[PDB]
């Protein structure tokens, strides 16, 4: 009922979401992620439970940013709603992930939040340690 983070993803990035489940749930971090295609029951109002899960039942929200995520309206809503809870990002609530290269622009409304970048080969080592640490805090 209480998760550590809600995972905002478009269907195309399900591969990386499952890699996240392996890396954060099924290891010593013992984190509890909310994945809509696994944990959200059918018959729920896509907007009502999105709002209910992200605001009350999930402590933070991780957003998987890609070219395909920009074309998702379900994600767009979820991201703008996540930003509403801390416009200034004082609560360190919205966690942007970049896992692969993007031909298109990083969302304008997210441009002053520290991205967990998995593309840069020189920083990749600290990606999982930093992300797990971010989700583990109150």
Author numbering: 159 to 296
Provide text from the study.
MyD88 and MAL are Toll-like receptor (TLR) adaptors that signal to induce pro-inflammatory cytokine production. We previously observed that the TIR domain of MAL (MALTIR) forms filaments in vitro and induces formation of crystalline higher-order assemblies of the MyD88 TIR domain (MyD88TIR). Here, we present MicroED and SFX structures of the MyD88TIR assembly, which reveal a two-stranded higher-order assembly arrangement of TIR domains analogous to that seen previously for MALTIR. We demonstrate via mutagenesis that the MyD88TIR assembly interfaces are critical for TLR4 signaling in vivo, and we show that MAL promotes unidirectional assembly of MyD88TIR.
Here we present MicroED and SFX structures of the MAL-induced MyD88TIR microcrystals at 3.0 Å and 2.3 Å resolution, respectively. The higher-resolution SFX structure (2.3 Å) was first solved using the MicroED MyD88TIR model as a template for molecular replacement followed by iterative rebuilding and refinement using a different protocol compared to the MicroED structure (SFXa). The SFXa map showed well-resolved features, including water molecules that were not modelled in the MicroED structure. The MyD88TIR SFXa structure was used for the comparison with other TIR domain structures and for the analyses of interaction interfaces within the crystal. The structure of MyD88TIR within the MAL-induced higher-order assembly exhibited conformational differences from the known NMR (RMSD of 2.4 Å for 107 Cα atoms)61 and X-ray (RMSD of 2.0 Å for 118 Cα atoms)62 structures of monomeric MyD88TIR. This is especially apparent in the region encompassing the BB loop and αB helix, and in the CD loop. Analysis of the crystal packing reveals MyD88TIR higher-order assemblies, each consisting of two offset parallel strands of TIR domains, with subunits in a head-to-tail arrangement forming each strand. Based on the SFX structure, the intrastrand interface involves opposite sides of the MyD88TIR domain, which together buries ~18.0–18.6% (1500 Å2) of the total surface area per subunit in the structure. It is composed of interactions between residues located in the BB loop of one subunit (BB surface) and the βD and βE strands and the αE helix on the next subunit (EE surface). The interstrand interface buries ~12.0–12.2% of the total surface area per subunit (991 Å2) and is composed of interactions between residues located on the αB and αC helices of one molecule (BC surface) and the CD loop and the αD helical region of the partner molecule (CD surface).
